[PDB]
Design a protein around this nucleic acid. Structure first.
Lengths: 57, 233, 68, 118, 199
RNA sequence: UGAGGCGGGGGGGCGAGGGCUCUCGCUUCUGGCGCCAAGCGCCCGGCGCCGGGCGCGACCCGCUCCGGGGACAGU
RNA sequence: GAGAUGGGCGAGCGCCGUUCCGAAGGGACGGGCGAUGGCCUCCGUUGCCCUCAGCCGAUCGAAAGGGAGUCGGGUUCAGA
């Protein structure tokens, strides 16, 4: 519907009950969930291998 | 006892790692059009070779003797509009049924009586906008044998009278008790200004480079001198 | 007074004291606007000779005019 | 005193109010658009009378610088009726014609006689 | 007596550029603290087409380290860049295609494009369709660099000015022969009124 | 360029022969996220209860906003 | 596209130019303070102090560009 009509129609017609609902497509929302977790997990793998480096050096 | 929920969360402000906090930025502020003009005029008072007849206005009298001289000058303040009014009602009441020595403000009062040699001490302001209005006067009282001292700021010198600014104040005569109070000052002042006239003439002012250039030229003076030292052995 | 002492100084424009101080204001005015107000005369001896009386009602404007 | 932004914003100076020693003009000018100047005269048209029986309205010739709100209060306070709506138009000759639909509990056919038009 | 056609073009008002559908100023990112000392990471959002430029444009998007806001620039694309490719920006960045860095940190003979001719002017040199510049020789004393330009003219320039790596996309455009006068007409109708040339 | 960290002097990690020479003050596989101080210490105000501040965090010093030309372009 | 201000130029009417050599926001958020009203309740309103701000250039420019929201029946010598 036309964007000036968006004042008329209520909240439930203008989004979907979800994180990023109404602003992002779910197919690339789960791909944002998968992306956000794997990166922070791999980021922890960075710290652990940097914990052995200065003990032997 | 302590809540274990309190987690320490430091922030690594590394390059491309975290947003910068609101630190100081006073050295990179785009200053107004009038302030940027206002500051680099002090730079040009250090860059160029300042001629010594106006370089003699950074060669100013110290802290503690400025206290006593104004204390000596806090006793000869001029009659105000009230102290004239309370003077004139005192002379008009004696009409029905000599002046003490007071100061002289302004150059037009001073430069006359120095030519008549009536002055015993001259007080000078150093930061007049047309510096040409004062520049002759130190080189004049040297030829008139009148002791002169320069004071930093015209406003604190401007409060001897109840006006804004005063360029020159004269001590023409004093009270009987205020004789040894100045005779030690002239003996401490003329050993800075009048008898040391010749040495001020050969001391130009400014001729200073920048701390980003004296860091540059000296660093090549340090890299060259550290070469030639080990060339002998 | 001291005005005559200032009078013969301003006739010494080639001297080093004037050659400096002239180039300061010339640099200073060149960073300003083309038409603006000065609070007090920078050249007071030439002011009163031309009729300037220092009182309320006398306002002076310092401008820059293109050479050539 | 630490500057956060490198662009220096002009300080928000205090401003005073207008506390004049004297009013610029002497007296408040009389409004020349009072209740009588707005209502010049009604009409006598063979097409205006047919407008009165059917639609229950009144026709007028109103001053050109008036608005629909001022027409609604002018009829309301000079002939003492209440108004449902007012429809204006500007005639070719220049003055502003106004159809005045009154409150539906009144009959303008009677009120045409108190203002005289028949 | 009359004003010649070549004289009228300096006045403009007809021969001025047709700048309606053009995207914007195809510049480099400006210099700053992060680009001066380290490197900064970027994201190429999309590759748009600028009318009147036979070379394409790319929408690179940055993350400012001073205020929480998302910055977008218009880089001149290097052939090989794809959407979603972390392009790096700074002096501490490495050497691959679509990765801008000051010349003095690079080794010799490197093919680059979209080059500056002064430090920090957001690039001027070698930014047509499919041209490049080659770093001929550095000079660690006084920080100077000899660089070749796509005309055959070798140029001395400083070491702080920077350039993306790789050729500009759309190389070899002039190999296609425009055959009918309309394609040239439709070419120059996106730049300026200059196409029908009268001998 | 919204003029956002310029230059010295200090603080530590990479390294051979307890300072000295210096690299360096932290970010690279990936279409995610990042502002509106945690933490820590120390003052003050009020009925153990709620609410303010200073300094660290986030060195210090400075005079030219960074740069590039330059007594030559230019007028 | 047109066209003010700052600025620049011009003997001068003026012209230049529209982010460019500019202190270009008269805005709020909450907080503290001081006050005012209607059941000075609670909220509304004004003043000071503290804190916040990327805007981007005054303005004009379309009765075919953009632009929420009305239709059926009946009515006049002429209006829907």
């Amino acid at each position: 519907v036309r964007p000036k009509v968006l004042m008329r129609l209520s909240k439930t017609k203008k989004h979907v009950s979800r994180a990023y609902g109404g602003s992002m497509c779910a197919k690339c929302v789960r791909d944002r969930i998968k992306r956000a977790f794997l990166i922070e997990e791999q980021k922890i793998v960075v710290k652990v291998l940097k914990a052995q480096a200065q003990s032997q050096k | 006892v302590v809540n274990p929920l309190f987690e320490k969360r430091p922030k690594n402000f590394g390059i491309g790692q975290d947003i910068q906090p609101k630190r100081d930025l006073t050295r990179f502020v785009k200053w107004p059009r009038y302030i940027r003009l206002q500051r680099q005029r002090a730079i040009l008072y250090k860059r160029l070779k300042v001629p010594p007849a106006i370089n003699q206005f950074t060669q100013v009298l110290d802290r503690q003797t400025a206290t006593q001289l104004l204390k000596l000058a806090h006793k000869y303040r001029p009659e105000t509009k009230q102290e004239k009014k309370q003077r004139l009602l005192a002379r008009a009441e004696k009409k029905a049924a000599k002046r003490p020595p007071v100061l002289r403000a302004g150059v037009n009062t001073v430069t006359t009586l120095v030519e008549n040699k009536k002055a015993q001490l001259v007080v000078i302001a150093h930061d007049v906008d047309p510096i040409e209005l004062v520049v002759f006067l130190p080189a004049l009282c040297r030829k008139m044998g009148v002791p002169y001292c320069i004071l930093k700021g015209k406003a604190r010198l401007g409060r001897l009278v109840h006006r804004k600014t005063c360029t020159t104040v004269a001590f023409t005569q004093v009270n009987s008790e205020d004789k040894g109070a100045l005779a030690k000052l002239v003996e401490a002042i003329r050993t800075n200004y009048n008898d040391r006239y010749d040495e001020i003439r050969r001391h130009w002012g400014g001729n200073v480079l920048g701390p980003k250039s004296v860091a540059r030229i000296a660093k090549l003076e340090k890299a060259k001198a550290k070469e030639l030292a080990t060339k002998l052995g | 007074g001291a005005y005559k002492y200032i009078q013969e100084l301003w006739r010494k424009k080639q001297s080093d004291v004037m050659r400096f101080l002239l180039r300061v204001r010339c640099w200073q005015y060149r960073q300003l606007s083309a038409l603006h107000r000065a609070p007090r005369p920078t050249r007071p001896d030439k002011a009163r000779r031309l009729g300037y009386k220092a009182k309320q009602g006398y306002v002076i404007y310092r401008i820059r005019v293109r050479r050539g | 005193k630490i500057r956060t932004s490198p662009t220096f914003r002009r300080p928000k100076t205090l401003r005073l109010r207008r506390q004049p020693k004297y009013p610029r003009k002497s007296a408040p000018r009389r409004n020349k658009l009072d209740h009588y100047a707005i209502i010049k005269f009604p009409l006598t048209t063979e097409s205006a009378m047919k407008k009165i029986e059917d639609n229950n309205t009144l026709v007028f010739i109103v001053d050109v610088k008036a608005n629909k709100h001022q027409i609604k209060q002018a009829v309301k306070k000079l002939y003492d009726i209440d108004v449902a709506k007012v429809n204006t138009l500007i005639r070719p000759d220049g003055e502003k014609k106004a159809y005045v639909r009154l409150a539906p509990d009144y009959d303008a056919l009677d009120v045409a006689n108190k203002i005289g038009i028949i | 007596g009359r004003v010649i056609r070549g004289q009228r073009k300096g006045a403009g008002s007809v021969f001025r550029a047709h700048v309606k559908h053009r995207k914007g100023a195809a510049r480099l990112r400006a210099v700053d603290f992060a680009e001066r000392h380290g490197y900064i990471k970027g994201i190429v959002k999309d590759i748009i087409h600028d009318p009147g430029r036979g070379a394409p444009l790319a929408k690179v998007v940055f993350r400012d380290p001073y205020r929480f806001k998302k910055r977008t620039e218009l880089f001149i694309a290097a052939e090989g860049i794809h959407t979603g490719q972390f392009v790096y920006c700074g002096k501490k960045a490495q050497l691959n295609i679509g990765n801008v860095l000051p010349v003095g940190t690079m080794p010799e003979g490197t093919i680059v494009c979209c080059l500056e001719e002064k430090p920090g002017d957001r690039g001027k040199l070698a930014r047509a369709s499919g041209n490049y510049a080659t770093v001929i020789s550095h000079n660690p004393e006084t920080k100077k660099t000899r660089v070749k330009l796509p005309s055959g003219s070798k140029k001395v320039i400083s070491s702080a000015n920077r350039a993306v790596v790789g050729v500009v996309a759309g190389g070899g455009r002039i190999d296609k022969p425009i055959l009918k006068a309309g394609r040239a007409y439709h070419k120059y109708k996106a730049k300026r009124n200059c196409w029908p040339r009268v001998r």
